[PDB]
Ligand SMILES: NS(=O)(=O)c1ccc(NC(=O)COc2ccc3c(c2)OC(=O)CC3)cc1
């Protein structure tokens with residue numbers, strides 16, 4: 001099956017998922033000089049005060065913190081979006097070394113990790129239908145650099161021992177995702193895709209300019225997770241990122257001058 005190894009990694013995905021060579025694939029390099037300020041972009045509206053986290057799962061490619069998305073509780077609106085997008089899960093991508101790990105890059109710079117807060121357009125009724133639509137998802141991407149610890153991430157870090165291997169899950173209630181945001185909501189935006197199979201071209205990408213700082217110990221703990229299931233040779237969950245894909249016929253717009 002697909003993964004991030006030499007024999008099943010990103011260069012192989014097109015054989016089972018031909019859209020991997022499509023016209024709006026993600027991630028991309030964000031060339032900050034070529035991104036144009038769009039004064040018609042509105043501020044992002046992040047309404048997470050009623051978020052209800054439920055569970056954390058190691059799915060064999062990352063860990064997902066999952067939310068109750070059966071009502072409008074944690075929603076993203078505004079920015080480039082029309083309508084209301086409900087938070088369903090967040091996860092990260094990260095490297096084996098602090099110098100790599102992000103999916104998006106900024107002037108070819110790689111951050112140590114990248115957080116994806118995944119939301120689906122409520123006009124499509126549930127997540128499975130949304131991913132079949134060109135405006136079905138809005139993913140908020142936030143870069144992680146290594147420096148000072150992020151206090152709001154520590155609850156995530158400390159449960160990872162309990163989901164070391166693929167298929168393990170743990171209760172994860174009462175987690176506040178606002179503790180993962182940077183101060184500024186300035187962003188870049190462009191039309192793209194899921195960055196893992198099935199690579200569907202259903203995502204409005206909203207990538208924040210301001211990274212968050214996490215400590216070396218925090219990302220160290222991400223790197224102790226396993227891609228494999230319990231009882232099967234240990235493969236550390238590192239470098240679970242897809243590299244930048246061709247921009248093709250797309251413009252990245254900036255919300256800020
Ligand atoms: N890296 S990315 O572009 O942000 C990116 C973001 C999101 C995805 N896809 C998903 O999360 C899938 O969600 C699901 C899928 C299946 C089921 C679910 C929830 O619940 C169940 O009942 C069992 C079935 C891929 C990539």
Ligand SMILES: [Zn+2]
Nearest residue numbers: 091093116195
């Ligand atoms: Zn992701």
